[PDB]
Amino acid sequence: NFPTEYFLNTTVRLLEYIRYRDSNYTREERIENLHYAYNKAAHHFAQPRQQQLLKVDPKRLQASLQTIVGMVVYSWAKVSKECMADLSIHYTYTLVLDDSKDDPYPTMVNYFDDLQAGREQAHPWWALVNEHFPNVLRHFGPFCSLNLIRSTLDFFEGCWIEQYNFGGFPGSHDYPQFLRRMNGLGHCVGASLWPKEQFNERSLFLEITSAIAQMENWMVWVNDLMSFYKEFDDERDQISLVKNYVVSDEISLHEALEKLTQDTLHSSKQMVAVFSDKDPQVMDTIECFMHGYVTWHLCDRKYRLSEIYEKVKEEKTEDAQKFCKFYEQAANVGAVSPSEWAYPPVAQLANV
Angle between helices 318-334 and 4-17 (to 10 degrees): 60
The annotated binding site for Mg(2+) is made up of 98, 162, 223, 227, 231, 237, 239
The annotated binding site is made up of 98, 162, 223, 227, 231, 237, 239
In terms of CATH, what superfamily is 1-352? Farnesyl Diphosphate Synthase (1.10.600.10)
Mention every residue, 6+ apart, whose C-beta is less than 8 A from residue 144.
191, 192, 194, 196, 201, 208
Terminal CA-CA length for the chain: 49
Region label for 118, one of left (φ > 0), alpha (ψ between -120 and 50) or beta (otherwise):
left
- Choose among 70, 96, 73, 92: nearest CA to 83: 73
Q: What is the DSSP string of 71-91?
A: HHHHHSTTS-HHHHHHHHHHH
Mention every residue, 6+ apart, whose C-beta is less than 8 A from residue 26.
333
Side-chain-side CA neighbours of 291 within 13 Å: the count stands at 24
SS3 317: coil
Distances 13 to 18, 232, 262, 292 between C-alpha atoms, Å:
9, 21, 11, 17
Side-chain-side CA neighbours of 217 within 13 Å: the count stands at 18
Q: What is the resolution in angstroms?
A: 2.5
Angle between helices 124-137 and 81-97 (to 10 degrees): 160
Method: X-ray
Counting every residue written for the chain, the total comes to 352
The answer to whether the beta carbons of residues 302 and 30 sit under 8 Å apart is no
Domain definitions of the chain by residue range:
1-352
